[PDB]
Write an enzyme that holds these catalytic residues in place. Structure first.
Site, short mmCIF file in Angstrom:
data_model
loop_
_atom_site.label_atom_id
_atom_site.label_comp_id
_atom_site.label_asym_id
_atom_site.label_seq_id
_atom_site.Cartn_x
_atom_site.Cartn_y
_atom_site.Cartn_z
N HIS A 96 112.34 76.25 -12.03
CA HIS A 96 112.38 74.89 -11.47
C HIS A 96 111.47 74.89 -10.24
O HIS A 96 111.41 75.89 -9.52
CB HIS A 96 113.77 74.49 -10.96
CG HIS A 96 114.85 74.53 -11.98
ND1 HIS A 96 115.50 75.70 -12.33
CD2 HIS A 96 115.43 73.58 -12.77
CE1 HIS A 96 116.38 75.42 -13.28
NE2 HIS A 96 116.38 74.15 -13.57
N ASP B 199 113.13 76.46 -7.26
CA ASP B 199 113.34 77.90 -7.29
C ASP B 199 112.12 78.64 -6.73
O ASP B 199 112.28 79.72 -6.15
CB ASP B 199 113.48 78.43 -8.74
CG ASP B 199 114.63 77.86 -9.56
OD1 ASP B 199 115.71 77.55 -8.94
OD2 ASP B 199 114.46 77.75 -10.77
N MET C 75 106.98 78.03 -19.56
CA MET C 75 107.77 76.83 -19.42
C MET C 75 108.10 76.65 -17.94
O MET C 75 108.29 77.62 -17.20
CB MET C 75 109.05 76.96 -20.26
CG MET C 75 109.99 75.75 -20.20
SD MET C 75 111.14 75.74 -18.79
CE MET C 75 112.47 76.73 -19.45
N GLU D 48 116.56 69.16 -22.86
CA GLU D 48 117.64 70.14 -22.97
C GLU D 48 118.97 69.43 -22.96
O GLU D 48 119.41 68.98 -21.88
CB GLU D 48 117.55 71.12 -21.80
CG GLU D 48 118.69 72.12 -21.79
CD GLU D 48 118.46 73.25 -20.84
OE1 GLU D 48 117.41 73.26 -20.13
OE2 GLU D 48 119.38 74.13 -20.80
N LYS E 267 123.08 68.71 -22.99
CA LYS E 267 124.33 69.30 -22.57
C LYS E 267 125.38 68.23 -22.62
O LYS E 267 125.07 67.08 -22.23
CB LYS E 267 124.23 69.87 -21.15
CG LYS E 267 125.40 70.73 -20.73
CD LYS E 267 125.30 71.23 -19.30
CE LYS E 267 126.39 72.21 -18.97
NZ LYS E 267 126.41 72.58 -17.55
N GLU F 65 120.29 74.82 -25.92
CA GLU F 65 120.88 76.01 -25.34
C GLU F 65 122.16 76.37 -26.11
O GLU F 65 123.02 75.52 -26.33
CB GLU F 65 121.24 75.78 -23.85
CG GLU F 65 121.90 77.00 -23.20
CD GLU F 65 122.20 76.83 -21.74
OE1 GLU F 65 121.32 76.50 -20.96
OE2 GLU F 65 123.40 77.05 -21.38
N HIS G 5 125.47 75.23 -24.59
CA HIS G 5 125.66 73.79 -24.44
C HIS G 5 126.18 73.16 -25.73
O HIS G 5 127.13 72.37 -25.70
CB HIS G 5 124.36 73.11 -24.01
CG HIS G 5 123.99 73.47 -22.61
ND1 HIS G 5 122.86 73.01 -22.01
CD2 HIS G 5 124.61 74.29 -21.70
CE1 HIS G 5 122.86 73.59 -20.76
NE2 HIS G 5 123.88 74.34 -20.55
N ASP H 154 116.86 78.06 -25.39
CA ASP H 154 117.58 78.79 -24.39
C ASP H 154 118.71 79.59 -25.03
O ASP H 154 119.60 79.05 -25.69
CB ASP H 154 118.19 77.88 -23.33
CG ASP H 154 117.22 77.31 -22.33
OD1 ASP H 154 116.01 77.64 -22.35
OD2 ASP H 154 117.66 76.51 -21.51
N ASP I 89 130.34 75.75 -18.55
CA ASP I 89 129.12 76.44 -19.01
C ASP I 89 129.08 77.83 -18.43
O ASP I 89 128.89 78.01 -17.23
CB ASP I 89 127.92 75.61 -18.57
CG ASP I 89 126.59 76.08 -19.10
OD1 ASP I 89 126.52 76.52 -20.27
OD2 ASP I 89 125.60 75.96 -18.39
N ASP J 49 127.12 80.62 -19.46
CA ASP J 49 125.82 81.25 -19.38
C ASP J 49 125.97 82.79 -19.43
O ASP J 49 125.31 83.54 -18.71
CB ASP J 49 125.03 80.76 -18.16
CG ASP J 49 124.45 79.34 -18.34
OD1 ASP J 49 124.59 78.75 -19.39
OD2 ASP J 49 123.97 78.80 -17.32
N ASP K 240 118.53 81.60 -20.61
CA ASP K 240 119.10 80.80 -19.55
C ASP K 240 120.52 81.29 -19.38
O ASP K 240 121.43 80.79 -20.04
CB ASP K 240 119.03 79.32 -19.83
CG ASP K 240 119.42 78.48 -18.63
OD1 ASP K 240 119.82 79.04 -17.60
OD2 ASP K 240 119.31 77.22 -18.73
MG LIG Z 1 108.98 81.77 -3.56
MN LIG Z 2 119.38 76.02 -20.51
MN LIG Z 3 124.27 76.50 -19.73
O LIG Z 4 122.59 76.60 -18.32
#
Ligand SMILES: [Mg+2]
Ligand SMILES: [Mn+2]
Ligand SMILES: [Mn+2]
Ligand SMILES: [O-]
Ligand SMILES: [Mg+2]
Length: 386
Positions: free
Chosen positions: A53, A56, A87, A180, A182, A216, A219, A244, A254, A256, A286
């Site tokens: 993202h 991030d 991606m 994506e 969910k 995902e 999800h 994902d 969720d 993960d 993910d």
């Molecule tokens: Mg950085």
């Molecule tokens: Mn995902």
């Molecule tokens: Mn998830």
């Molecule tokens: O996720």
């Protein structure tokens, strides 16, 4: 055995291994990771690339100079390791401004901000090599019925994606969008809650060819759905632009979990499907290393994602290659499923007494499908008992 290499196309989000372990009832259990450290550690584990993202990679609210600093250190780590960025995506969920959505926020000024934030990051994604730009509308939805007029929200969602498609067309970018789905969390109900809903929405966009799905595992399983089946429908539609991979232990928050954990047989059938379909995109995880883990457990969990894919790939290939399985598939009429029902057309079907008037329904009904034998061969292959 089962050692990943870049050839295997495994990718990870910065936010996966970099998750500090905050949950709705808990403070962080691990320190923030430098994206440069993540690139280097994932490269040594055999990954092919990373995803991000915007927020991030570049802390929210960074000055232009700070921005450029973060991007340069990241590009230098990518370049040194040979890690790719297939991606990228926008964070339209963490900041409190997005508390009612990004693209479908009731406040118009927020919707416009969401679009600008996305466009800025599309430009960066393209320079770093991303071929797919993911949108996870985690804040699009409602806790209560009158808070969100869903038809109108879908108008706003369409307007946003159509504007993004106009922008990338205007710029001459190669990059495609992937929605994506969910079903819930962090909103009580999220718009476009499943693969199906997202596929359907895409067909109403101005340029549908620019949009696909990024499903995902966990999800779809939060709706109790069969993830392999939903992936099959996405592949059938030509819309599996990205995927994902993770694990989920049923209908709950969720989780993960690392890939392979949760519904193991569904992970097997997913790998079987991706490999027989010839999916060529990234094998993206993910996932979140559980907050019980320290940094050494982070890298063990990431390694486990890849290992489990590779084990399942071997087992699925052995299943499909086994002459005993090829015979069981015939016994179960999987070959007959591929024959057209009525290529002879409507008038021939209507005139065919063997299709109705003279069809022996009881003889047909008495024929077992032999699905349990087939499935036990599959079980035996998964478990290495063949
Ligand atoms: Mg950085
Ligand atoms: Mn995902
Ligand atoms: Mn998830
Ligand atoms: O996720
Ligand atoms: Mg469009």
């Amino acid at each position: 055995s089962y050692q990943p290499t870049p050839e295997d196309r495994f990718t990870f989000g910065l936010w996966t291994v970099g998750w500090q372990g905050r949950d709705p009832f808990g403070d962080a259990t691990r320190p923030a990771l430098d994206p440069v450290e993540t690139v280097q550690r994932l490269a040594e584990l055999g990954a092919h690339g990373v995803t991000f993202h915007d927020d991030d990679l570049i802390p929210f609210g960074s000055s232009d100079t700070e921005r450029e600093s973060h991007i340069k250190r990241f590009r230098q780590a990518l370049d040194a390791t040979g890690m790719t960025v297939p991606m990228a995506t926008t964070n339209l969920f963490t900041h409190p401004v997005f508390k009612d959505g990004g693209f479908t926020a009731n406040d118009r000024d927020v919707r416009r901000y969401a679009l600008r934030k996305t466009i800025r990051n599309i430009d960066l994604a393209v320079e770093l090599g991303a071929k797919t730009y993911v949108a996870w509308g985690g804040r699009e939805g409602a806790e209560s019925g009158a808070a969100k007029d869903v038809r109108v929200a879908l108008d706003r969602m369409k307007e946003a994606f159509d504007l993004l498609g106009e922008y990338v067309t205007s710029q001459g970018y190669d990059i495609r969008f992937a929605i994506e789905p969910k079903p819930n969390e962090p909103r009580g109900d999220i718009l476009l809650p499943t693969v199906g809903h997202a596929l359907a929405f895409i067909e109403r966009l101005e340029r549908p060819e620019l949009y696909g799905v990024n499903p995902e595992v966990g999800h779809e399983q939060m709706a109790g759905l069969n993830f392999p089946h939903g992936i099959a429908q996405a592949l059938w539609a030509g819309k599996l632009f990205h995927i994902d991979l993770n694990g989920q232990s049923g209908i709950k928050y969720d989780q993960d979990l690392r890939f392979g954990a949760g519904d193991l047989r569904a992970a097997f059938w997913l790998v079987d499907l991706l490999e027989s379909a010839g999916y060529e995109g990234p094998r993206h995880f993910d996932f979140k290393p559980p907050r019980t883990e320290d940094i050494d457990g982070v890298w063990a969990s990431a390694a486990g994602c890849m290992r489990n894919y590779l084990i399942l790939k071997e087992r699925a290939a052995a299943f499909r290659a086994d002459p005993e399985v090829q015979e069981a598939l015939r016994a179960s009429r999987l070959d007959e499923l591929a024959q057209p029902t009525a290529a002879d057309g409507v008038q021939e079907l209507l005139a065919d007494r063997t299709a109705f008037e003279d069809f022996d329904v009881d003889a047909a009904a008495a024929r077992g499908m032999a699905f349990e034998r087939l499935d036990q061969l599959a079980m035996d292959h998964l478990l290495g008992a063949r």
